[PDB]
């Protein structure tokens, strides 16, 4: 889900802009799923070492399954949603091996029929 961008989306250049945009998200300046230039404030605020941590944080109501967030998967940092990560884990547990399950899915698009 994406809602609205209310502040200066410029983020690639300024390294001090992280604190300013975090403060803006503290107020009602920018939503968590903001349509920023490079990254949303949701990806900046929450970073998860493992999918288990992301799903546990979802269980606590901090972030929804439809939230953009940075998750450190087996070998890479992915700016995805906990719902997509959970779907990937569902596929990976339905079958035995996880590498094949990871390579036979596309976790960048909604799961249409």
């Amino acid at each position: 889900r994406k809602e609205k961008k209310g502040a200066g989306l410029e983020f690639a250049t300024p390294e001090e802009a992280l604190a300013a945009h975090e403060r803006g998200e503290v107020a009602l300046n920018a939503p968590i799923k903001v349509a920023g230039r490079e990254t949303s404030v949701g990806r900046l605020k929450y970073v998860f070492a493992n999918p288990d941590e992301a799903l546990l944080a979802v269980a606590h109501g901090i972030v929804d399954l439809q939230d953009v967030v940075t998750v450190r998967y087996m070998g890479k940092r992915l700016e995805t949603s906990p719902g997509r990560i959970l779907f990937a884990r569902i596929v990976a547990e339905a079958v035995e091996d996880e590498k094949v399950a990871w390579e036979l899915i596309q976790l960048d698009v909604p799961q249409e029929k």
């Binding site: 889900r1 809602e3 109501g61 929804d64």
Partner: protein
């Protein structure tokens, strides 16, 4: 909601999170208190429901109401015509009872 407030109850926290989630979905206008937000949600015909099995509310509002549901004519059609051995016909011996 007047009957609800008669006993001295406000808005449940589960209702609060349901209302904020619906606000993210555009169902209710933002900047309003849970009172009139829930009123506007009621105008849509949708109210907050609780799962009952888990206790947590169903994400997003649920439409509920009163429906006139009637049971249709129910003959032997549902009954299982399951046989293992029965009558056989005269010309051919294919069984039909």
């Amino acid at each position: 909601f007047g009957k609800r407030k008669g006993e001295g109850f406000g808005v449940d926290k589960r209702e609060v999170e349901v209302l904020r989630r619906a606000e993210k979905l555009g169902l209710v206008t933002p900047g309003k208190t849970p009172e009139e937000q829930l009123k506007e949600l009621f105008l849509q015909g949708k109210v907050v429901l609780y799962d009952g099995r888990t206790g947590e509310p169903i994400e997003g509002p649920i439409v509920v109401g009163q429906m006139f549901i009637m049971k249709l004519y129910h003959m032997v059609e549902d009954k299982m015509h399951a046989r293992s051995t029965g009558p056989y016909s005269l010309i051919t011996q294919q069984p039909l009872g």
